Design a protein around this nucleic acid. Structure first.
Lengths: 51, 147, 51, 125, 186, 128
RNA sequence: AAAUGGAUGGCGCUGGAGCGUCGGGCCCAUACCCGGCCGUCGCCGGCAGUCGGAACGGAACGGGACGGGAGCGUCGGGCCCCGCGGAGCCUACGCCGCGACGAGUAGGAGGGCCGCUGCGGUGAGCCUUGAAGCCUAGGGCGCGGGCCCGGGUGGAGCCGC
RNA sequence: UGGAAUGCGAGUGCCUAGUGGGCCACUUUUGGGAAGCAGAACUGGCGCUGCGGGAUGAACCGAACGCCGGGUUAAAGCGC
RNA sequence: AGUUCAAGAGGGCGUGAAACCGUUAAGAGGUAAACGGGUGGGGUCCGCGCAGUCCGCCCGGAGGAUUCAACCCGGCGGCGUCCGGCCGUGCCGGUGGGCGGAUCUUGGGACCGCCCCCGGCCGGCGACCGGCCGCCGCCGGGCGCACUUCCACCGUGGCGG
């Protein structure tokens, strides 16, 4: 396995990781949803500082 | 880009660059770092001395936050204040000396690599090195300890 | 084929700003704009500014 | 600058034709229509173009004026020369040589004028 | 007949691997100068324009001041085929005439504030086509991290070369082979 | 009439026959398109006597007559009248071939325009 | 003395087509010499000098005395002329010159205007006056990967950079 | 007086695939009656290599290869 | 026979490859076929094939039409201490009132460094503009009305390619 100089690597891929993979393709969607929640909350408490 | 890779130029060659005699088998050696003491104990000794064995004493529940002590050398001490501060201080005739608060710039300990300009200065830090304190005094400054 | 293929690339902000400056500078040279097939004739000035 | 723009359009242009081992350029003021720094009709401060007249007789000679390099509308002065073949060649020769306006392109302009004048004379089988 | 062919093709750069058109224009300029002039300065500059970035290390402002303060170097132009970086450990900058491909913003400000002049290689050709009155400087070529790992192997007796180590600590390649109490120490 | 080139050199071909793939004669699945035989015991690869010849760079033609037609011209593919005008200043060494996808109406215009530009057409009678 | 019928290779050869020692001729290799063409490698190789004046081996200034002259004291001589004019060039990633060399499994590298499908630009691209696809004793190109055109069939899309 | 001859441009770094079954011959050589047997040394070769000759043949003799025209040879030949 | 543009679209029917087979045409045939290199014979197709070139200058013959050469008017270009506006470094005067600063404060201020603007001085045109004055070129018009200029034909014409 080892070939000349290198690093002794210990990857943690022994545990059926492909069943638990978190992709972030919904990341832009959750930014808009968080943003629209902030804007709706600010209107609902309109005079209050909304922060 | 798959069109810039070796597989494109390996079409038509029966062995895919892996040889006819030895072939490309699943795991001719072990898997991973297998045999580091038995059949790979030349690679491990030649390139990773110290890999096997135990050295030192354990320390349970290590919290790196209390061992936090960033360091700054004397050759970078005057970069923590503006250039105009050093020029005005040097041109001043009296014994007044500017203060560099090293902790304000995110450093706790002052080390003494380098040299200082002949310009007195008051340096505030949590810890000082022996040569750092001697060089600050030799220029005409003072070392002030801050908790 | 797997969904966790790297689809996205991040470019340095300085390089992205560099590319915009180069694109703007080239847009003011009529030879480069005609080399894009943009039919810039009878146009009074290539850096066209209107009110 | 001509050399700076040439390094941009050398292999990337809308006028570039690559086909069966030869290269051509179709910009309107390129004598010989070849992809070359010397003959490119867009990247120089002074270029010469020879085109057939609007009608079927004569040669229109295009010359780039010195000023307004960023003003495409007024960058080109066009002269219609409609006389006999020997006089047409002499006029194009004097415009390029007596003005010292791109003497590098003198023969190329003259050959292109002869091709256009020949193509206008009637074809008899 | 009866010859070897394994060393017939010399491996060297005959052009920059870069597609940067501005570097290609300086290569066009100095290709002409290396040919039509007997100057060996123009030949050396042409070679360094081809060279890769690892072979064109940045030149510190402090080191250029060091090398331009040597006797007889006054009123000469420091030529760097590379980047001139700023050194914050230097507090006084004299007046220098420096030609470089790139100069960092803080280095350029310090050089200009001192009264010096910064030139490009096209202005250097116009001022000194031969390369007269110049000091041809270079950054430290082996002053980068990969060279600490190169050479005689770490597990070999008199070797001081850095191993490839994932993390640094007491538990990472320090016991057997690095210590007489654990096997051996060469 | 028949437009002739500026020069008509004697074209010398080192080989007129096509290099055929090994055993393309024995199988229909093996097309005649050339493949270099990478076989440990292959005798075409080893250059035995009386076998199928392998192409190599020694067969390359003279650079003065490379890509030259028997008429002495070199062919340039053309799709419309405007592309034909690119051969105005190289009409004694280059000829125009109209693409197969050009319609019948457009071929008449290209042939008529090429006739008055002294540009030789390889295929002027197509789709007449 | 060995088993199918068989092997100076065979036929055959005995003033030799046998054995030994020798001569002079002559025949053949991808080897050697000369020449052509392709490529690779090398030459710190040449060309930005496109000029009708232009070019390698020194030029540029001012002081005195001088001789070859045009002049009859001027070294002015980038300005010249009964012609007003003189091919091509240099996609510098281009073009040109000279010299040497070229076997290849496993394997490595480079180039590919070799090929397939989709996307961003571009071709004022192609197409029911006929796209793709398929067939072809037709014309050709390229060392090759392959490609272009002619003809037939087909009926709606396709390709170049 | 660059301190023999001859020839040649050298030095150096990183990364690195395949391989890690070999076999044959002159000479030397161990075991074996011996072997187209087993095991060594040196060099060359086959394997990776086609070409002329040995009728045929991995290794012998000659000679190593881009596509061609002329000329000449090697080893070997010139009754058919 | 009819429908359809098309039945070479006829209800597992778009196009319709190969393997395999039938038939027609041509050729061949006792060392299984098939292959490489040379030729030769026959055949299908191809060549606006079947009296063979095409350009420039000059020489003659005869024809036609006139602008040319020069000169005048008008228009447009190209080039260069003459002037003005810019683009600017540096350099001073600030109505500046501006941004920052780990400089001093006696939040507001003062000080410093830059940024822009105003005025004066100061250098250069090329991805930066005008106006005089010349010199040169081109185009349009007039005059120039024929030993000039131009356009076509003929010679089995001469030179170069």
């Amino acid at each position: 396995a080892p070939s000349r100089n290198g690093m002794i690597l210990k990857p943690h891929f022994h545990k059926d990781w492909q069943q638990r993979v978190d992709t972030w393709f919904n990341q832009p969607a959750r930014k808009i949803r968080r943003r629209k929640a902030r804007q709706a909350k600010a209107r609902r408490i309109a005079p209050r500082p909304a922060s | 880009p798959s069109r810039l890779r070796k597989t494109r130029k390996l079409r038509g060659h029966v062995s895919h660059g892996h040889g006819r005699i030895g072939k490309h088998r699943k795991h001719p050696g072990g898997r991973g770092n297998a045999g580091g003491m038995h059949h790979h104990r030349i690679n491990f000794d030649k390139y990773h001395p110290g890999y096997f064995g135990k050295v030192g004493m354990r320390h349970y529940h290590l919290k790196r936050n209390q061992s936090f002590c960033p360091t700054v050398n004397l050759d970078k001490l005057w970069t923590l204040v503006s250039e105009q501060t050093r020029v005005n201080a040097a041109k001043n005739k009296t014994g007044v000396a500017p203060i560099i608060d090293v902790v304000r710039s995110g450093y706790y300990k002052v080390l003494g690599k380098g040299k200082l300009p002949k310009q007195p200065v008051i340096v505030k830090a949590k810890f000082f090195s022996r040569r750092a304190e001697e060089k600050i005094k030799g220029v005409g400054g003072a070392c002030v300890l801050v908790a | 084929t797997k969904t966790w293929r790297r689809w996205h690339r991040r470019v340095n902000t300085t390089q992205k700003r560099y590319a915009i400056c180069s694109a703007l500078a080239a847009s003011a040279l009529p030879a480069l704009v005609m080399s894009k097939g943009h039919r810039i004739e009878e146009v009074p000035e290539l850096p066209l500014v209107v009110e | 600058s001509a050399h700076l723009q040439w390094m941009v359009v050398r292999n990337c242009s809308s006028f570039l034709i690559k086909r069966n081992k030869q290269t051509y350029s179709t910009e309107p003021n390129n004598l010989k229509a070849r992809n070359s720094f010397r003959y490119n009709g867009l990247i120089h401060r002074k270029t010469v173009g020879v085109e057939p007249a609007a009608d079927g007789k004569g040669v229109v000679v295009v010359m780039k004026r010195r000023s307004g390099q960023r003003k495409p509308a007024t960058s080109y002065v066009r002269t219609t020369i409609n006389k006999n073949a020997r006089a047409t060649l002499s006029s194009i020769r004097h415009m390029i040589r007596k003005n010292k306006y791109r003497p590098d392109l003198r023969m190329a302009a003259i050959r292109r004028a002869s091709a256009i004048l020949r193509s206008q004379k009637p074809v008899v089988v | 007949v009866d010859i070897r062919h394994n060393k017939d093709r010399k491996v060297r750069r005959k052009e920059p691997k870069s597609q940067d058109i501005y570097l290609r224009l300086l290569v066009k300029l100095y290709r002409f100068l290396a040919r039509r002039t007997n100057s060996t300065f123009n030949q050396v500059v042409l070679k360094r324009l081809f060279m890769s970035r690892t072979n064109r290390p940045p030149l510190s402002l402090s080191r250029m001041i060091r090398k331009m303060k040597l006797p007889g170097r006054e009123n000469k132009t420091a030529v760097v085929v590379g980047t001139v970086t700023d050194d914050v450990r230097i507090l006084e900058v004299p007046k220098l005439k420096v030609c470089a491909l790139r100069v960092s913003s803080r280095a350029r400000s310090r050089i200009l504030k001192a009264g010096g002049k910064i030139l490009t290689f096209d202005q250097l050709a116009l001022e000194s086509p031969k390369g007269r009155g110049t000091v041809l400087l270079s950054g430290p070529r082996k002053g980068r991290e990969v060279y600490r790992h190169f050479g005689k192997a770490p597990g070999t007796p008199h070797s001081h070369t850095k191993p490839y180590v994932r993390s640094k600590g007491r538990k990472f390649e320090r016991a057997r082979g690095r210590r007489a109490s654990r096997g051996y120490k060469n | 009439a028949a437009l002739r080139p500026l020069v008509k050199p004697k074209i010398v071909k080192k080989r007129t026959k096509k290099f055929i793939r090994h055993q393309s004669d024995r199988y229909v699945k093996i097309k005649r398109n050339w493949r270099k035989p990478r076989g440990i015991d292959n005798r075409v690869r080893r250059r035995f006597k009386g076998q199928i010849l392998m192409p190599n760079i020694g067969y390359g033609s003279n650079k003065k007559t490379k890509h030259m037609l028997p008429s002495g011209f070199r062919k340039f593919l053309v799709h419309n009248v405007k592309e034909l005008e690119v051969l105005l200043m190289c009409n004694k060494s280059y000829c125009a071939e109209i693409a197969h996808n050009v319609s019948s109406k457009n071929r008449k215009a290209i042939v008529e325009r090429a006739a008055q530009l002294a540009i030789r057409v390889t295929n002027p009678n197509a789709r007449l």
